[PDB]
Amino acid sequence: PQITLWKRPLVTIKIGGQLKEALLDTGADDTVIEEMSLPGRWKPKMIGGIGGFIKVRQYDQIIIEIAGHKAIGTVLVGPTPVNIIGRNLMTQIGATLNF
Amino acid sequence: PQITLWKRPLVTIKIGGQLKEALLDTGADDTVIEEMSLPGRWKPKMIGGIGGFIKVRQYDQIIIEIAGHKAIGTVLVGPTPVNIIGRNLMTQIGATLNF
Ligand SMILES: CC(C)(C)NC(=O)[C@@H]1CN(Cc2cccnc2)CCN1C[C@@H](O)C[C@@H](Cc1ccccc1)C(=O)N[C@H]1c2ccccc2C[C@H]1O
């Protein structure tokens, strides 16, 4: 689709077989999802944004459906304020900015 | 133009008589520019990122050119590691996400 930016660009995702709402975030290098049970192995990491750093669980090679499009890649899980789809997965679904 | 997401989507902006590099950020509600001595009145604000909140100065009706496209709107100034162009100004230049 073509998505305008008058409202937050929220989409439905499926991760670990569960549906969630997430923000398409071109300013995010990575994808970070709120705390959940997720099948796979993980390693601890820290990520930083406005306001500082948070501790997350890094899961690699996770299947995630984003607005009906498949991606398979790195998903961080931790105390993010909103679910965020970052560039690592937006590139996989072919998303670009246009103006 | 079209901007892919393999790398951070940085563009040149003009604000306050200065050229800067800034990130086109669909996840940002607001526009946040690194500390600079902009003239006139402002209002204190706090804004929340992934790691918590920071204190910024809110300036209204600030002219800013984004990749050659003029816009005018609210600009927040404060200690950010990156200049962020948020939705409030991206809408004004007709930016969309497409996939
Ligand atoms: C107005 C303001 C800019 C404060 N908004 C944000 O920070 C929002 C906050 N919401 C949350 C919110 C908070 C409070 C209220 N409403 C919403 C989550 C999404 N962010 C937008 C992010 O796109 C901002 C970028 C800024 C940044 C870019 C590069 C380097 C440093 C900072 C951001 O935090 N990006 C980081 C990021 C993000 C996710 C995963 C990994 C990484 C690394 C890094 O790329």
Curated annotation (Swiss-Prot), chains A, B:
The active site is at 25 (for protease activity). Residues 1-5, 49-55, 88-99 are annotated as: Dimerization of protease. Residues 20-89 form the Peptidase A2 domain. Disulfide bonds: none annotated. It comes from the Viruses. Homodimer, whose active site consists of two apposed aspartic acid residues. This is Protease. The gene is gag-pol. The chain holds residues 501 to 599 of 1447 of the full protein.
